[PDB]
Design an enzyme around this catalytic site. Structure first.
Site, PDB file in Angstrom:
ATOM      1  N   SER A 253      38.578  33.502  38.478  1.00 55.83           N
ATOM      2  CA  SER A 253      39.357  32.480  37.918  1.00 55.83           C
ATOM      3  C   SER A 253      39.346  31.400  38.919  1.00 55.83           C
ATOM      4  O   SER A 253      39.563  31.665  40.097  1.00 55.83           O
ATOM      5  CB  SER A 253      40.816  32.890  37.543  1.00 55.83           C
ATOM      6  OG  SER A 253      40.852  34.117  36.818  1.00 55.83           O
TER       7      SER A 253
ATOM      8  N   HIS B  99      46.190  27.065  41.014  1.00 52.95           N
ATOM      9  CA  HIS B  99      45.600  28.400  41.093  1.00 52.95           C
ATOM     10  C   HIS B  99      45.208  28.469  42.535  1.00 52.95           C
ATOM     11  O   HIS B  99      44.901  29.526  43.059  1.00 52.95           O
ATOM     12  CB  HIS B  99      44.344  28.636  40.164  1.00 52.95           C
ATOM     13  CG  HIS B  99      43.259  27.645  40.455  1.00 52.95           C
ATOM     14  ND1 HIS B  99      43.396  26.249  40.347  1.00 52.95           N
ATOM     15  CD2 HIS B  99      42.027  27.915  40.908  1.00 52.95           C
ATOM     16  CE1 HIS B  99      42.214  25.776  40.662  1.00 52.95           C
ATOM     17  NE2 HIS B  99      41.313  26.734  40.938  1.00 52.95           N
TER      18      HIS B  99
ATOM     19  N   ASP C 211      51.651  20.688  37.027  1.00 50.11           N
ATOM     20  CA  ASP C 211      50.907  21.015  38.274  1.00 50.11           C
ATOM     21  C   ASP C 211      49.536  20.402  38.321  1.00 50.11           C
ATOM     22  O   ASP C 211      48.576  21.117  38.470  1.00 50.11           O
ATOM     23  CB  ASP C 211      50.919  22.521  38.703  1.00 50.11           C
ATOM     24  CG  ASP C 211      52.313  22.945  39.002  1.00 50.11           C
ATOM     25  OD1 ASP C 211      52.912  22.385  39.981  1.00 50.11           O
ATOM     26  OD2 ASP C 211      52.805  23.762  38.205  1.00 50.11           O
TER      27      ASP C 211
END
EC number: 3.4.21.90
Lengths: 52, 171, 52, 171, 52
Positions: D123, D49, D71
């Protein structure tokens, strides 16, 4: 029908006992593999209901 | 003695709310309620009496992969259908005495409710809890004693795919 | 004869297999859920190949 | 007004109303917050992210060995970084409620929040138990129908990385 | 030519079929053996992810 000599005796398979006659016969394993799969699945359901 | 902590309303001024709220939907075929649908568990299990009776047509077409042996679905539906149904299950509360009937006893391997309805198309209604988890799906039952024994398909943390009492009617 | 025999092994295998995939889903679900466990996956791989 | 265990002196110098952290830093890209960095544990789990946003160019290049198929990064950072580094997570608490916002209940193998979150720029905040143990970092989300299923990377007691209902997409 | 004498017919590996030839050839075997193990370690980690 190539030709390659083979024995002309004992069992009736119509070129008789031959490496070719044995190789054609080897379908016999196919019906057995499909049967082992059916036995396991039929017994395993009954076993699940009982298990829980 | 008293309560010496709270983490929620300490008191009340009246009752006008309901402890749990249904999320069920009745399902039609020839314009008749021949079951109830909800779309519950992680992998989605409902059909047993709503195989025939349509949820939405597209949805009917979409879902089916089944163990038609006992009528359990192992296919799942979209998130879209799922949010609008009762809450999902992954465990068994057995402390619950409310859904649509006044008490739900689990003893002697049998769910009972007191003597109720067992009229056509009552089948496929979930037994929902006080946090709305679905413990069992009604296939039918039979009245005896002063209770109604129920026949169910289950799936919680413990599971039996269709199990039936000694005596049964097809509700 | 031999040529016809091979086709019987394929027809029987495939049709049975399908029934086997529905039991493979059922058994670990009912056994002991089965909703987040890795256990489902080993049986499941077979079941995915069968259905599709 | 005696309670079970006093957790305030009866004054607003300790409170029961916390909802944020002080280990957060937002990481800018184009003048926009497209994530948050915190450098979580000592073997640093962050970029998923903030792979495409990063924090500074120098710490990333140095550190980064990864398993890019899920990831997750694996690799230690020095003493400087570690002194202000978040909590090491190697265990999984069950049930959570804070992250940023007012629910992240973990039941049925899903975290859900109400509709009105999953927004980016909010986020990258960790899901905390009030001790700063991180079971997952929130990457984005998808609306179910009335609730929002969340996009995550997890690493706590077990992996099971990117617990989702069937497909959520990072946003 | 090995330089130890070796002679075997009807196929010759160039130093024919001998212990020493077999031993030298054993190189080829190495990647293949480890390869079976390698797949397994990759798989088990994937089963966990899939499980949910």
């Amino acid at each position: 029908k190539d030709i390659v000599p083979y024995a002309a005796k004992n069992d009736a398979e119509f070129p008789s006992i031959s490496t070719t006659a044995w190789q054609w016969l080897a379908t016999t394993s196919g019906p057995l593999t499909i049967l082992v799969v059916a036995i396991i699945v039929v017994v395993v359901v009954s076993i699940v209901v009982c298990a829980r | 003695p008293t309560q010496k902590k709270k983490s929620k309303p300490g008191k009340r001024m009246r009752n006008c709310m309901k402890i749990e709220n249904d999320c069920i939907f009745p399902v039609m075929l020839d314009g008749k309620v021949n079951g109830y649908a909800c779309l519950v568990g992680d992998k989605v299990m409902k059909p047993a009496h709503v195989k025939g009776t349509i949820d939405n047509p597209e949805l009917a077409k979409l879902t089916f992969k089944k163990s038609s042996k006992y009528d359990l679905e192992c296919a799942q539906v979209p998130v879209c259908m799922k949010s609008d149904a009762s809450k999902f299950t992954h465990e068994k509360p057995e402390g619950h005495y409310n859904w649509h009937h006044g008490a739900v006893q689990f003893s002697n391997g049998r769910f009972t409710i007191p003597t109720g309805s067992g009229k056509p198309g009552d089948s496929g209604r979930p037994i929902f809890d006080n946090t709305g988890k679905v413990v069992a799906i009604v296939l039918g039952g039979a009245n005896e004693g002063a209770r109604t024994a129920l026949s169910v398909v289950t799936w919680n943390k413990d599971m039996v795919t269709r199990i039936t009492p000694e005596e049964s009617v097809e509700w | 004869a031999s040529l016809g025999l091979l086709i019987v092994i394929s027809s029987g295998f495939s049709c049975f297999l399908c029934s086997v995939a529905r039991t493979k889903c059922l058994t670990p679900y009912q056994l002991a859920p089965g909703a987040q466990l890795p256990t489902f996956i080993a049986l499941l791989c077979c079941a995915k190949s069968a259905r599709a």
